[PDB]
Amino acid sequence: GHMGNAAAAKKGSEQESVKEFLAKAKEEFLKKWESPSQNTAQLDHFDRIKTLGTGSFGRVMLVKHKETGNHYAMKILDKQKVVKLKQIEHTLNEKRILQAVNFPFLVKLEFSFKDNSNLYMVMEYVPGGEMFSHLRRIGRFSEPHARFYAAQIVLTFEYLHSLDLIYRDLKPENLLIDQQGYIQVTDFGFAKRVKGRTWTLCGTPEYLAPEIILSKGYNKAVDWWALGVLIYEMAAGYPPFFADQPIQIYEKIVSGKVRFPSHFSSDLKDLLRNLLQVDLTKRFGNLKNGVNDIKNHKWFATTDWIAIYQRKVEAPFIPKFKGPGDTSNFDDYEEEEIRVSINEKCGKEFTEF
Amino acid sequence: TTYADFIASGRTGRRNAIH
Numbered sequence: 001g002h003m004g005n006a007a008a009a010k011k012g013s014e015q016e017s018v019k020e021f022l023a024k025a026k027e028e029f030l031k032k033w034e035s036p037s038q039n040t041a042q043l044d045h046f047d048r049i050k051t052l053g054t055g056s057f058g059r060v061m062l063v064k065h066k067e068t069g070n071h072y073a074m075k076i077l078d079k080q081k082v083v084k085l086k087q088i089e090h091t092l093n094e095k096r097i098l099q100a101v102n103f104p105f106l107v108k109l110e111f112s113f114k115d116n117s118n119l120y121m122v123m124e125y126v127p128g129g130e131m132f133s134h135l136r137r138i139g140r141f142s143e144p145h146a147r148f149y150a151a152q153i154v155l156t157f158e159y160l161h162s163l164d165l166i167y168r169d170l171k172p173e174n175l176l177i178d179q180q181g182y183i184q185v186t187d188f189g190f191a192k193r194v195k196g197r198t199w200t201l202c203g204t205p206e207y208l209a210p211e212i213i214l215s216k217g218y219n220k221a222v223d224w225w226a227l228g229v230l231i232y233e234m235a236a237g238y239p240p241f242f243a244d245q246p247i248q249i250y251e252k253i254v255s256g257k258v259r260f261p262s263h264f265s266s267d268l269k270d271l272l273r274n275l276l277q278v279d280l281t282k283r284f285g286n287l288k289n290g291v292n293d294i295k296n297h298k299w300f301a302t303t304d305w306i307a308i309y310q311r312k313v314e315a316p317f318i319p320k321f322k323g324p325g326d327t328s329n330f331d332d333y334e335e336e337e338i339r340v341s342i343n344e345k346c347g348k349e350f351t352e353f
Numbered sequence: 354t355t356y357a358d359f360i361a362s363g364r365t366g367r368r369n370a371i372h
């Protein structure tokens with residue numbers, strides 16, 4: 001067989017230990033999911049420094065907590081805009097997930113609160129910036145560098161899926177790099193509790209699984225497809241399926257054809273053909289062996305999964321960092337004042353926040 | 354080349370979700 005006795009025993013034991021970890025983690029998650037945290041700070045506790053990113057509902061700002069001097073990333077959402085854009089459930093769900101999960105590669109929610117106008121989620125500040133920026137700048141990541149990041153996503157999805165959470169928005173734009181060079185997954189706006197199937201068309205065109213495009217009921221396997229897209233894009237510098245317009249991207253995704261750069265190793269191409277598998281009965285992460293088909297693949301043979309989890313592996317890349325409030329790994333955005341109104345705008349809708 | 358085709362797509366910047 002592929003393993004002698006010692007290696008087979010060690011692998012079996014490791015896999016049973018994962019099961020034991022996940023059972024405890026699910027019990028802890030369910031306690032917090034049923035009793036969420038609320039109203040742990042207020043706006044005048046922080047100085048607002050600089051906008052780090054923007055979205056349709058609001059912005060993320062670097063803030064400094066006055067009493068402690070600690071920096072955080074504050075997501076500000078305008079309640080009226082959230083309602084106008086039909087995002088009430090997603091916004092409440094994102095906060096509920098963030099306060100209930102706990103994993104070393106998932107960004108932590110440190111405080112949350114609301115006022116007349118806005119919702120506020122104060123998260124750890126992740127100072128290395130977006131993987132997207134580093135990838136476009138460097139061009140591509142070497143296979144060991146891509147693998148280091150991929151391993152963190154594998155573990156994070158193994159965790160989330162054990163909780164029956166599907167993530168649904170993996171892409172470099174949503175992965176931040178911390179001061180030690182490890183990933184922080186951000187943005188749970190599309191994540192959903194799904195033990196069976198779900199049907200919403202959501203995600204980003206290049207990262208959509210075929211079954212989403214084809215309007216089928218789908219499951220956690222869409223995240224394993226997206227991992228394939230991510231690994232490909234990290235290692236190539238461009239994603240496997242692209243075109244001028246989304247419809248042409250979708251035709252390529254559903255085709256069952258994918259082409260690889262000549263510098264991809266055979267092990268990498270094998271992994272990617274098994275992740276980017278249109279046929280759900282054949283896609284890695286969706287078979288009887290579950291996540292183990294991925295973790296035990298030859299491309300990951302050098303990966304020490306526990307060492308990655310414990311953050312004891314030396315990162316391939318440490319972002320530039322001048323000090324606690326350095327924002328040099330984020331872009332510059334036009335700044336706009338935050339206006340709190342005498343509207344209790346949309347109080348009923350956001351009672352649970 | 355494939356890279357040139359990627360540049361030609363115009364989708365080299367940050368990509369929005371469908372929402």
Ligand SMILES: N[C@@H]1CCN(Cc2cccc(-c3ccc4c(O)nccc4c3)c2)C1
Nearest residue numbers: 052053054055060073123124125126186187
């Ligand atoms: N899913 C879309 C991708 C971009 N995202 C909004 C955005 C754009 C750019 C940067 C950030 C950002 C920046 C810093 C953060 C940080 O330091 N911690 C948590 C979340 C953060 C989020 C947020 C929403």
Ligand SMILES: [Cl-]
Nearest residue numbers: 196197198217
């Ligand atoms: Cl069904």
